[PDB]
Automatic annotation (TrEMBL):
The entry's keywords: Repeat, Signal
The protein's name: Sel1 repeat protein
Organism of derivation: Oxalobacter formigenes OXCC13
Domain of life (superkingdom): Bacteria
Residues included from the entire protein: 62 to 194 of 195
Length: 133
């Protein structure tokens, strides 16, 4: 009923959380018809709207070539925005990009910082490399 109507109305008003949830429903066909063009549209709007979880998911699509062509540079920039915001999964993915030189110049001094920030928030995969370092 109005559960989907309020969600769609909130996404139109500028709710980045509603835009991301609405993007997931279009992608998985949960509650709505499976529409890929609409799923990426709301994910773009939520990522550029400022949602870190949407910026990290949009950065993964550029890393895996899902929905868009595989671009390591655009994947690094989207993961960077979500990492600066404080998303723990994006901070781990960013430190991985710094040591490997994928999408950015290879660096060890900057890779340890994002490993130090992601592990400080409790990321489990960010402290395995931090001690095997």
């Amino acid at each position: 009923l109005r559960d989907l109507m309020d969600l769609k109305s909130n996404a139109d008003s500028g709710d980045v959380s509603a835009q991301f949830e609405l993007s997931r429903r279009y992608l998985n066909g949960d509650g709505l018809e499976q529409n890929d063009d609409e799923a990426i549209r709301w994910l773009r709007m939520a990522a550029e709207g400022g949602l870190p979880r949407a910026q990290a998911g949009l950065g993964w699509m550029y890393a895996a070539g899902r929905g868009v062509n595989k671009d390591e540079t655009l994947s690094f920039s989207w993961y960077e925005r979500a990492a600066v915001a404080g998303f723990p999964v994006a901070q781990y993915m960013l430190g991985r990009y710094y040591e490997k030189g994928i999408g950015v110049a290879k660096d060890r001094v900057l890779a340890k910082e994002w490993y130090e920030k992601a592990a400080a928030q409790g990321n489990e995969k960010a402290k395995k490399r931090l001690q095997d370092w």
